[model samples]
Target: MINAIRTPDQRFSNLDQYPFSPNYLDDLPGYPGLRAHYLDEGNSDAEDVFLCLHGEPTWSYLYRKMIPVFAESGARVIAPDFFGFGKSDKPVDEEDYTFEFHRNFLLALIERLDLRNITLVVQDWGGFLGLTLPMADPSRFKRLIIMNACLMTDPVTQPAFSAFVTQPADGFTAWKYDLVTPSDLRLDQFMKRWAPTLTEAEASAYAAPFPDTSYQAGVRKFPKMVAQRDQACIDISTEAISFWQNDWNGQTFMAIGMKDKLLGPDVMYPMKALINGCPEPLEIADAGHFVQEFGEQVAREALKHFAETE
Candidate 1:
C-alpha cells in the first residue's frame, strides 16, 4: 500500500479561468487509496480523442486554453494530472518519482480509459511519456500535436534536435530546494523569462500543485530522474522515430514557442522533419517554454489543419 496525499480542495476553490469539472479514478493497479485526477470534457462519444499530457511542475490546468478549442469541436479531450503534479494524489518522497513510476501510471490511465483514435498532444515530460505510448499500442493513436519537448538523449542523429539535448537540463537539489523554504521564486523567474504574458491567476495556477516544499518532492525529483537514461525510453523512442517516419499514418501538427531557450525552433525543426509528413510549424515567436501560453491559438490552427483533410 503506497502512501499518497490529496491536495486540499480549498486550495483550488474558486480558481479563475479553470472551470472544468474534476474527474477521478482510483482503481489503477497497485495504487490503493489514491485517486488520480483528469479533465474529461466534450462529447462522451466522439471519434476523436485529444489526450493532452502536461509536463514537469505543471498540471492539467495548463491545458485550459487548448482544451476548450478541442472540446467545442465536439471532440473528446482528456488531460490527466500525473500522479504528483495536479489534483492527483502526491507521494511524499522524491525517490518515488522515477521514470518507470511515471510511465507506468500513464500506461494505466490510457488503458483504463480505453481511448482510441487519439490525437496525442504532448510537451515536455508529456511528450516523453506520450511519445512512447503508441509504440506499445499504435492502433489506439491516430494523430499527434507536438511541441517544446524531446526524448532525453539524442535518439536520432539530427542537428536541430541534438542541440536541445546538449543544453543544460534543469534540476534542483535537496539543499537548493531547502534554501528557498517553500517559495516559488524559480517559477516566478521562469514564467517572467519564458511566458511573459501570463496573468497573475495563470501563474498561480501553474504553482498551485506545490503549496509548499513538502508537496514538491516529485518536482525536485523529475529532473534528477531523467538523468539516469532509462534504456526503455531510448528503445521505445527509437522505435517511435521509425514508426513516425515510416509506418505512422496520421496527421501531425508541430508548433514552436520560438522564444523558449529550453526547446525552441532549433529543437523543433528537426522533430518536424522526423514526423513523416509534418508541415511547417505554426511558430509563436513571443511564447516560451510552455507553448501552451498560446495554446488556444495553437489548438485552433491544428483543428483547422485537420478539418482541411475532411
Candidate 2:
C-alpha cells in the first residue's frame, strides 16, 4: 500500500470565490486507501461533460473562474485534484508520483464515472497528461479547449513543443528554478509572483493544500518531471501528436495567454498548427502563465465558438 497524506478540511474552508462542495472516490481500481477529490457541478445528466484538469502546483481550484461559466451553460463540469494536489490524498513518497501514476488515476476516474461526450479542457501539466488521454478511449472525447499547454514530444523531432526542456533564460527556466530550488516552497508567494494578477485571497487559496513543506512533494516533483521527460513520456506524447493531427475529428478552441512567457504565443502557435481543425486563437494579452486565472472570458468565448459552429 502507498502511504499518503490528506490536507485538512479547514484549509479549504471559506476559500475566496471557491464555493463548490467536495466529492470523493476511494475505491478506484489501482488506488487503494487514498481518496481522490473532484468537483461535479451542474446537471448530472447533462450530455456535455467538461473535464477540467489542473496542472503543477495548482489543483482543481485553478478552474474556479471557468467552472461556473461551463455549468451555467447547461453542461456538467468535473474538475479533479490530482492525487497529490488539491483535496486528494498526497503520496508522501515523491517517487510514487510518476507519469503513469497520475495518468492512470485519470483513466480510472473516467472509467469509474463512465463519462461520455467529454469536452477536454486542459492547460500546463493538465494538457501534458490530458492531451494524450483521448487516444486511449477515443469514443468518450468529442471536443477540446486547449490553453497554453503541449504534448511532451521528442526534443529532436518536435523541438518547439518540447522547448520547455531546451530553452533557457525564458520564463519557464526561471519558474522551474524557483519551484525546484526552494527548500521551503511557499506556494502563495510563488503563485503571486508568477501569476502577478491574483488577489491576496486568491494567492492564499493556491497555498491552501500545503500547510507546510511536507505536503509539497508533488509541487517539487512536477518541475523535475518536466526537466527529465522519460522515454515513456516522449513515446506517449509522440503518439498523441499523430492522434490529434490525423485521428481526431473534434471541435477545438485555442486560447493564448499572451503574456505567458513560459508557454505563450511562441509555444501555443506551434501547438495550434499540430492539432487538426484548431482555428485561430483568442489571445488574452494581459494573462500570464496561469491562463485559467483569466479563464472566465476564455470559457465564454469557447462556448460561443462551439455554439456558432454547431
Candidate 3:
C-alpha cells in the first residue's frame, strides 16, 4: 500500500473560517497511502446521489455552494478532488500524471466507494475524466450533465485549444483566474464577491489543495494532456464518444454555456451529431466555461431537473 501523504499544515490551517464541511475517504488504491478529500452533504439515506467533478486549478471548492443545496434537498452529494488538486495526494513529479493514470485512479476510487444510481455533473476536463468512467461502466451512472466540456479526438488541433496548451505555466494559471474573475473585479473585489457566497474559511479551504507551485503539477499537465498530439487522450475521447453514440444514447445531456470562450456552443453541432439520439441540449445564458462558478443557479436547476427527469 502506498503510504498516506501529509498535507502541508500551512495550506488549510485557516479552514475554520470556511462555511463548508470536509470529509475524507482514506487509502484509495493506486494512490496508495493518500486520502481523498471530498464533501458529502444532505441526507445520508437519500436515494439520489449527485457526484460532481471539477477540472483544472479548482478543487471540490468549486462546488461548495452547490454541494450542500443538493444534499439538503434529500440528495447525497459527493465531490472528490482530483489528485494533486484539493485534499487528494499530489504527486511530486509531472511524470506521475497521465491521462490513463488519472482515469484509472478515479475509476478505482468510485468502485471502492460503491456508489450507484448517480447523477454526474461534469465540466471542462471533468467531462473527459468523469464521462470516461461512465462509458466504461454505464451501470454505475444514471444520468450525465455535461457543461462546457467536450469529448473529441480533435480538441487540440483547434487554434484556440492549441493556444491554451502552449501557454507558459504561470501565465496559464493567471490567465484562468483573470478570465473567471470577471472584468472590473480586483482580487479583493473578487474575494468579496466570493466571500458573501462562501465564508473566509471556505475560501481558504479552497486554496488549501493548491499550496504551491510544485503541487500544481496536475493542473499544469491537464491542459497538455488534452491537447497532446501524440497522447492517447485523443484516442480515448474518440472511443468514448463512439461508444456513447452507438450504445449509450439518451443517457447524456449537454448544458452548455454559450459564452464559453474556450469550449462554447460552437462545438455543440459535432457533439450533437456524434451523440445522434441523445436528449436535447440546454443552454445556460450568461455563463462561461466555468459555468459552475459563473452560473451556479442555472446550472443547479438544470442539473436537478435533468437528474430527476432522466
Pick by lDDT: 1 or 3, better one: 1
Q: Please provide, for model 1 over 13-75, each residue's C-alpha lDDT reduced to its tens digit, 9 standing for 90 to 100.
A: 867699999999999976777799999999979989999999877899889999999999989
Question: lDDT of each prediction vs. the true structure?
Answer: 0.78, 0.92, 0.65
Better of 1 and 2 by TM-score: 2
Candidate 3 clashes between residue pairs 3 or more apart in a chain or in different chains = 2-33, 3-33, 4-33, 17-201, 18-201, 18-202, 42-71
Q: Write the per-residue lDDT of candidate 2 for residues 1-310, one digit (tens) a residue.
A: 9988889999989699989989999999999988999999999899999999999889999999999999999999999999989999999888988888889999999999999999999999999999989999999999999998998887787788767655668677888888878888889999999889899999999999998888888888888898888888889988999999999999999999888877888889989998999999999989887999999999999999999976
For each candidate, give its TM-score against the true structure.
0.90, 0.98, 0.78
- Show model 3 residue runs off by greater than 4 Å: 1-6, 13-18, 155-206, 229-231, 249-251, 307-310
Ranking by TM-score: 2, 1, 3
Which candidate wins on lDDT?
Answer: 2
lDDT of 3 by residue, 1-310 (tens): 4322445756665654235567777677766666677777777677778888888656777776677667666788888887777777777776677888778877886788788878788887777677667677877777666777667366444343344443545333444554333433232233334234445554555556654455666666675565554457777776786666777744566777776556666655456656645567777676656667553574566565665764
